[model samples]
Target: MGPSLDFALSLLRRNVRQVQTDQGHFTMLGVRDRLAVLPRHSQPGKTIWIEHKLVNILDAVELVDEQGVNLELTLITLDTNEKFRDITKFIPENISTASDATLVINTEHMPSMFVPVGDVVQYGFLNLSGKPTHRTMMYNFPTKAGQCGGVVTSVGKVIGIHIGGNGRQGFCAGLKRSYFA
Candidate 1:
């Protein structure tokens, strides 16, 4: 559908999220039970704005410490109850680990009239290069505010996160497996 949000993507949009600490910003995705994921930044007293509600930040833990793949990623549990939708290893399929795989990165911002503040946006997810545990670079792509840990490979599966990038290249942290037990 030329990157338009359809049936699967419509549900996937609910997983796209953003967070702001007293010091920094983080773009994230809803995953597992009541947790949201982002790059390896820290804060325990911040909250997230999802749709039309505000959820308090409850806990923060690194993925590798939680049996996750060797990547600089962190998963934070929020107080959103269960309102935020999660991208599980099930659902549409499973996470993709193949480099150069066709994908669409979803973020919370890009300036669109169809979406609200916490709404979603998508990109070609073009030009991905690197391993799952390393710095997968998205060339010709730029990471906007609140876009760290954005959803990569938005085709109904969460393959990576837009970890932060420079004006030259954007970074995505690959999600190779399920973080849930």
Candidate 2:
């Protein structure tokens, strides 16, 4: 049987989440596949695509202040076959579509860059060590007719974002400053 979306989400919220930086925190929404069975034989069972949301409570990095992060965000299918279906679009202004958007990160002159979820951001030594990091940013989730804040977690090491309700979910490397505040 497939995992229940509600239960899966709850589990993620309680367990998958953790504090990253003293500025922001991430929340896991859900993960789902639009297929009835595994699309690829190598995938084994009914493989599917993972989806979730990331929320930024604080902006210590001053992204909007320093960078004015406004770019098109994309949802990359975690599935192997679906990998080919990599998308680079926006999830309209409705949560019904559930499509990820193309969020442009605009760094106001300061060296700015966008990293994927699960990746780490290295700054310097002493102040920062092997403290790996992940790319995290705010984006919009398109439903059917409305849009809302959907957080994206780049895979790294610690607490990240998970999709699904409680049981069925995926984990990201999570960033200390990127996930929590």
Candidate 3:
């Protein structure tokens, strides 16, 4: 079964956090599992806040959650933070190119928009400047400079993370079910 529209809409108002560093402010997809998924290059030693409360990022890159999901994530454990039950709900393991998904960026400074899965494609080889990466996904969603967010299906399944893009198109690293299995 797929996720419900109500479930997917609830995510837009959840634990999404803004990571502020010396470089700039970026988005971090927050999960109730007590971990936040971040871009591979998110800098350390910067402040991250949710609702005006300061959050701590323990051990920048070399970390994982209690369930051991490689995290490929920036580690944050706020003793005083809200407890989230199914953080994985926002990161479904069953995404495909066939289904259309939604891109949610709940940050105030950035515009939040949806990308119909129709415009999203899973690529076998992505070539950039004559260099290619084996597997990735692309979409024609509008994006801003230094934008980061999550992509979820209408059924509420998380497909991937929005990493980089030009104003007209964008790219994301597709999520795999095996990574968590």
Q: Cα deviation in Å at residue 5, candidate 2? A: 5.7
Candidate 1 structure quality by residue, lDDT tens digits, 1-181:
7543563355445665544555455555676678767676534356655545577778877665333444566777877557565456532233344333333334334311121112123222333224234434343454444555555553444566666555655656556555544
Estimate, for each residue in 59-134, the C-alpha lDDT of model 3 and write its tens digit. 4553333554323334455545466555564455654664456666645466344445345687545443343433
Instruction: Give the least accurate 10-residue stretch of model 2, judged by summed lDDT.
Output: 34-43
Q: Which parts of model 3 are misplaced by more than 4 Å?
A: 1-5, 62-79, 111-117, 124-135, 177-181
By TM-score rank, best first, the candidates go 3, 1, 2
1 or 2, greater by TM-score: 1
The residue-level lDDT of candidate 1 at 67 comes to 38
Question: What is the C-alpha lDDT profile of model 2 across 14-104, one tens digit per residue?
Answer: 2222211121222212223211111011121122222232222211111111243311111212222221211112111211111221211
For model 3, name the residue pairs that clash.
Answer: 3-155, 32-84, 100-117
**How many times do residue backbones clash in model 2?**
56
RMSD from true fold, candidate 1: 7.3
